[PDB]
Amino acid sequence: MKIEEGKLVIWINGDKGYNGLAEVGKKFEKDTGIKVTVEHPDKLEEKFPQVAATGDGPDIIFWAHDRFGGYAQSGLLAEITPAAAFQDKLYPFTWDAVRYNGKLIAYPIAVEALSLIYNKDLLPNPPKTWEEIPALDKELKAKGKSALMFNLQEPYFTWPLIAADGGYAFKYAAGKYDIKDVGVDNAGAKAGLTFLVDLIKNKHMNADTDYSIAEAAFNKGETAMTINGPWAWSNIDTSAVNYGVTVLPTFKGQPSKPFVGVLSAGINAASPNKELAKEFLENYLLTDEGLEAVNKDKPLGAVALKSYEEELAKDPRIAATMENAQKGEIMPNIPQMSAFWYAVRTAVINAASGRQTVDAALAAAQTNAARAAAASEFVDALRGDLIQKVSSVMAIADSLMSERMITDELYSEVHYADTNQRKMRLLFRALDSGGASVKAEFYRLLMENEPRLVHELESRHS
Numbered sequence: 001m002k003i004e005e006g007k008l009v010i011w012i013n014g015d016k017g018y019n020g021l022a023e024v025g026k027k028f029e030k031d032t033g034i035k036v037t038v039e040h041p042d043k044l045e046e047k048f049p050q051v052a053a054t055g056d057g058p059d060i061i062f063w064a065h066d067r068f069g070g071y072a073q074s075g076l077l078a079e080i081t082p083a084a085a086f087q088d089k090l091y092p093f094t095w096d097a098v099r100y101n102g103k104l105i106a107y108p109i110a111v112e113a114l115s116l117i118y119n120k121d122l123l124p125n126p127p128k129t130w131e132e133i134p135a136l137d138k139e140l141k142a143k144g145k146s147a148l149m150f151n152l153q154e155p156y157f158t159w160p161l162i163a164a165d166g167g168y169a170f171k172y173a174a175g176k177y178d179i180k181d182v183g184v185d186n187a188g189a190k191a192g193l194t195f196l197v198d199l200i201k202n203k204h205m206n207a208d209t210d211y212s213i214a215e216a217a218f219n220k221g222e223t224a225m226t227i228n229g230p231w232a233w234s235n236i237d238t239s240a241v242n243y244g245v246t247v248l249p250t251f252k253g254q255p256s257k258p259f260v261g262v263l264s265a266g267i268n269a270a271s272p273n274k275e276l277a278k279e280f281l282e283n284y285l286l287t288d289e290g291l292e293a294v295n296k297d298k299p300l301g302a303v304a305l306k307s308y309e310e311e312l313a314k315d316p317r318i319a320a321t322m323e324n325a326q327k328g329e330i331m332p333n334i335p336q337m338s339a340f341w342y343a344v345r346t347a348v349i350n351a352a353s354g355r356q357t358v359d360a361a362l363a364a365a366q367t368n369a370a371r372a373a374a375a376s377e378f379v380d381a382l383r384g385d386l387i388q389k390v391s392s393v394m395a396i397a398d399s400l401m402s403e404r405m406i407t408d409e410l411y412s413e414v415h416y417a418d419t420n421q422r423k424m425r426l427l428f429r430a431l432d433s434g435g436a437s438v439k440a441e442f443y444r445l446l447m448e449n450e451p452r453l454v455h456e457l458e459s460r461h462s
């Protein structure tokens with residue numbers, strides 16, 4: 001069988017408390033005889049759909065909830081249905097984060113928000129505004145230090161500044177996220193990214209600073225500030241830096257607005273171990289003792305479990321995390337989120353490097369995100385019709401193979417399949433493997449090959 005019955009394989013990111021989770025797994029094993037194996041592969045959030053779309057992969061997948069609507073829409077997750085007594089154990093807003101089209105699609109674990117982390121010996125009174133950072137850096141440079149270093153390679157870390165004065169992913173309106181209303185190139189987003197690029201041009205930051213560079217400099221006492229989440233606090237404790245965790249700086253008087261993630265655990269739709277996965281998550285992990293084991297390894301942030309949060313709430317670092325979360329926004333969980341993030345990543349890296357201007361970079365991200373969002377929604381909405389009607393499927397598959405958006409394995413199956421509908425049934429496995437971006441590219445190719453079909457179906461859709 002594809003997935004092994006009688007054990008649990010769990011994937012979780014290498015920045016989280018995976019040794020603590022493995023300890024919870026050992027407790028489950030001693031009680032049930034069911035072995036629990038915890039793995040942290042690189043790029044797991046991309047690998048998960050690549051294996052789950054073919055019926056393989058881990059039994060349980062951990063990531064922030066923004067990835068989960070895409071997984072659910074791609075047929076990869078089991079519906080979660082806790083009894084009321086269990087549901088009442090977690091904060092209402094955490095269940096909201098894992099609700100997609102009426103159904104719960106994961107168990108929420110903990111609430112993560114970025115904060116400003118500062119060295120209290122170098123900087124007893126951290127800046128309340130982004131605007132005062134250049135003068136602060138000039139001052140620190142005279143003492144052989146710098147003001148601020150944080151990861152500039154992942155848009156998650158720059159988003160709070162881009163959002164502060166008006167950037168947004170998708171507008172919430174009429175009781176839903178409007179995928180036709182993207183806020184990546186408005187004046188607010190441009191102002192925040194321009195502020196960031198100006199820090200780099202003026203040598204207050206370097207475009208190539210990444211996670212490990214910023215962590216190393218802060219934990220060695222070389223830079224006075226960094227921006228990070230709760231999972232980073234463990235290494236800072238070891239480093240002996242006298243650090244504080246506080247509200248992010250304002251920009252143009254507005255709070256920085258971090259995108260808030262809820263670390264969530266989904267169950268693979270293909271798993272033959274769903275009932276014991278539910279027991280593990282509800283009755284071993286989501287207990288005071290379970291979260292304590294994980295949290296002691298790497299801090300989780302503010303946990304979804306109300307009883308355990310009582311233990312954590314008086315920690316000033318957790319209070320700061322929640323202050324920043326309340327000033328930010330919970331991420332959408334919609335499938336289009338991955339396309340938004342890929343677009344914004346490119347924009348920030350290109351603008352920071354000088355490859356593109358801020359205006360050009362964000363204009364391109366806006367166009368690409370909007371186009372992918374609409375195209376992927378179409379593809380998911382009209383799945384049954386596309387499988388029945390698309391005639392150019394082998395040409396589309398050939399094109400996807402060239403741009404490395406489909407595996408040799410799945411391409412092979414499409415190649416050997418007989419008729420168009422059968423090729424399409426198989427090709428949709430590759431679309432479900434590659435998420436919103438591959439679905440968007442499928443749409444673009446289809447519009448090139450069969451414009452009459454696309455226009456006919458779009459009439460029905462709208």
Ligand SMILES: OC[C@H]1O[C@H](O[C@H]2[C@H](O)[C@@H](O)[C@@H](O[C@H]3[C@H](O)[C@@H](O)[C@@H](O[C@H]4[C@H](O)[C@@H](O)[C@@H](O)O[C@@H]4CO)O[C@@H]3CO)O[C@@H]2CO)[C@H](O)[C@@H](O)[C@@H]1O
Binds near residue numbers: 066
């Ligand atoms: O090829 C470029 C890179 O592509 C891959 O990264 C993608 C992810 O696949 C996307 O999911 C998205 O990432 C988001 C992420 O979904 C979101 O939750 C948030 O991630 C935080 C996380 O919540 C927090 O717990 C902690 O782990 O830090 C994360 C930030 O590093 O923000 C992400 C966006 O920054 O977008 C990225 C690309 O930006 C792939 O993994 C990369 O290796 C690859 O280079």
Ligand code: NA
Binds near residue numbers: 240241242
């Ligand atoms: Na010290």
